[PDB]
Amino acid sequence: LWFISQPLFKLLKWIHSFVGNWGFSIIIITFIVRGIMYPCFPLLIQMPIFLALYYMLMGSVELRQAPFALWIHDLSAQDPYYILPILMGVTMFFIQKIMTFMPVIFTVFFLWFPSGLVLYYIVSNLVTIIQQ
16 A cells, blocks of 8 residues: 555545435546556556555545445455455456466465456456457
C-alpha cells in the first residue's frame, strides 16, 4: 500500500459520487484504473495492482458488509464461500508447464485475500476474453 496505492484510490474517489452498489465501484475502478494505466518482472510492478486494488476494496468506509448482487455479502474481507475463486479457475484456467496450474495456484493464493480483488482480476482476464 505504498507509492501507487492511495492516489489511484483517489481516482476511485473522483469516479464515484453515487455508484452505490459497491461491487460496481470495483468494476468501474476496473475500466478507469486500466484507463490511466494504459500509457521475475511480472510481479514487482504488482504493487499498484494488489495495493491500489486493496484500497479499491477497502474504500470508502462503507465496504465491509456491503451489497453485491447474488451471494457475496462481504467484499471487504475474504469470500466466506470462496466462490469467485472457483470462477477464477473456470475463467483464468482456460486461457488459449507450471502455468497450466497457476490459475488454481493463484486461486488458493487469493483465498488469503478478499474476493472483489479477484473480481478485478476476473474483469482484466475478461478483457483478454472479449478482445477476440
